[PDB]
Amino acid sequence: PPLEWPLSSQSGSYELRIEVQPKPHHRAHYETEGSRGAVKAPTGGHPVVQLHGYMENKPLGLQIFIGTADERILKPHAFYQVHRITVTTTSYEKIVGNTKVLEIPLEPKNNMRATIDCAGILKLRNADIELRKGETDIGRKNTRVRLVFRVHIPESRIVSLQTASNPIECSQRSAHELPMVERQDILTGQNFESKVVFTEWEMEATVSPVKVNFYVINGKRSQPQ
DNA sequence: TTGCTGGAAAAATAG
DNA sequence: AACTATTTTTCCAGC
């Protein structure tokens, strides 16, 4: 079942859930550089993923890849690949289509719970990707990703679950300069002479049914909401 | 050695 | 063909 297919995070009594979410900022590294580390959690630990409602005593693979955080439907990000780090967990890398995918064991003895400390992020160069035949996606200014996890549970048929993380900003500059919105309804985020502006219409909100968006502004705007 | 950075200069590029 | 403010890629330095 291709990565480009959408899947539920649950089916029947099975549910794949992100227990601890990644930080909102992880600076990716290039091939012309050293590793810039595993994706960290705000704890100072690491993302945690759990599968619920698996009763059997045989372990499963958890697959990890880097997807989009865009308005369109979710897909492998053309310009970022997961990076194996070699760390508590054993892991290995396979290719699936044009996409690199990392696989971690998910074990009954740990309640199908895993700490993700062995996945960093590699930034590919826009020029290189945009040349590949069949590719029309645009790198420039597309530096937000999500960790995507999927799992394959066999019966007698295969139930295939996917959960994607909150967006991560992988750009050094955007992390220094931009406000980032994590949660709403009280706004929490990062790098908050701040203003908040609603549009459709344009109207500053005062502060430290219809379809309509807001943005937090510094300069240097967050994404629309 | 490699891993893992922070910080920033060089290079690229959109319009 | 050339420019410039903005964005990406390489580079330096320090454990």
Q: Which two tokens stand for residue A78?
A: 């053309």
Tell me the nt nearest to A86, Cα to C1': B3
A78 CA, C1 C1': Å apart: 33
The phi-psi region of residue A10 (left if phi > 0; otherwise alpha if psi is between -120 and 50; otherwise beta) is beta
What kind of experiment solved this structure? Answer: X-ray
Tell me how far apart the alpha carbons of residues A112 and A55 are, in angstroms, rounded to a whole number. Answer: 10
SS (H, E, C) chain A: CCCCCCCCCEECCEEEEEEECCCCECCCEECCCCCCCCCCCCCCCCCEEEEECCCCCCCEEEEEEEEECCCCCCCECCCEEEEECCCCCCCEEEEECCEEEEEEEECHHHCCEEECCCEEEEECCHHHHHHCCCCCCCCCCCCEEEEEEEEEEECCCEEEEEEECCCEECCHHHHHHCCEEEECCCCEEECCCCEEEEECCEEECCCCCCCCEEEEECCCECCCC
CA dist., res. A78 & res. A133, Å (int): 13
Cβ neighbours, 10 Å, residue A127: 8
Q: Using alpha carbons only, how large is chain A's radius of gyration in Å?
A: 19
| CB neighbours of residue A14 within 10 Å | 18
Contact in structure between A82 and A35 (CB atoms under 8 Å) = no
Checking chain A for breaks where C and the next N are over 2.5 Å apart, the residues before them are 86, 156, 185, 192, 200, 207, 208, 219
Q: How far is the CA of A138 from the C1' of C8 (A)?
A: 13
How far is residue A17's CA from residue A124's CA, in Å, rounded to a whole number? 28
CA of A9 to C1' of C15 (A): 42
Residues A77/A68, Cβ–Cβ less than 8 Å? yes
For residues A193-213, one letter each, b for 16 or more C-beta atoms within 10 angstroms of the residue's C-beta and e for the rest, the string is eeebeeeeeeeeeeeeeeeee
Question: Longest Cα pair distance anywhere in chain A, in angstroms?
Answer: 60
- Residues having Cβ less than 7 A from any atom in strand B: A 27, 29, 33-38, 85-87, 120, 126-127, 140, 172
Residues β-bridged to residue A168 = A145
The span from the CA of A211 to the CA of A10, in Å, is 29
Q: Domains in chain A, please, with CATH?
A: 10-177 (2.60.40.340)
Which nucleotide has the shortest C1'-to-CA distance from A37? B4
